[PDB]
């Protein structure tokens, strides 16, 4: 499931929490969208939900990486983002 976002002055416009040690869902060490920022790209184009598992960003694997390591990959984006999401896979999917 992929979501193209246009990165801008508010970033991508969401907040993530997940990664090695920051696992949002017990048993699922993936990056999870924990908040979505007002007027953010992911709030407008994003069609994204709080609780979404990020597989990758610009198809760079976010699967079991350190939170800061992942966030840096989403941060190093400019005016375009290809967000790769899956719903909670190793846990209760929704």
């Amino acid at each position: 499931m992929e979501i193209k976002l246009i990165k801008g002055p508010k970033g991508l416009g969401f907040s993530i929490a997940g990664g090695v040690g920051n696992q949002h869902i017990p048993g699922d060490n993936s990056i999870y969208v924990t908040k979505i920022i007002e007027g953010g790209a992911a709030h407008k184009d994003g069609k994204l939900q709080i609780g979404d598992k990020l597989l990758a960003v610009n198809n760079v694997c976010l699967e079991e990486v350190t939170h800061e390591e992942a966030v840096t990959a989403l941060k190093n984006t400019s005016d375009f983002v290809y967000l790769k999401v899956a719903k909670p896979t190793g846990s209760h999917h929704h």
């Binding site: 907040s15 090695v20 040690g21 908040k35 989403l74």
Partner: peptide, 11 residues
């Protein structure tokens, strides 16, 4: 160590 575990962060 800017972004961290046990906390969410805006991208």
């Amino acid at each position: 160590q800017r972004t961290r575990q046990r906390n969410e962060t805006q991208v």
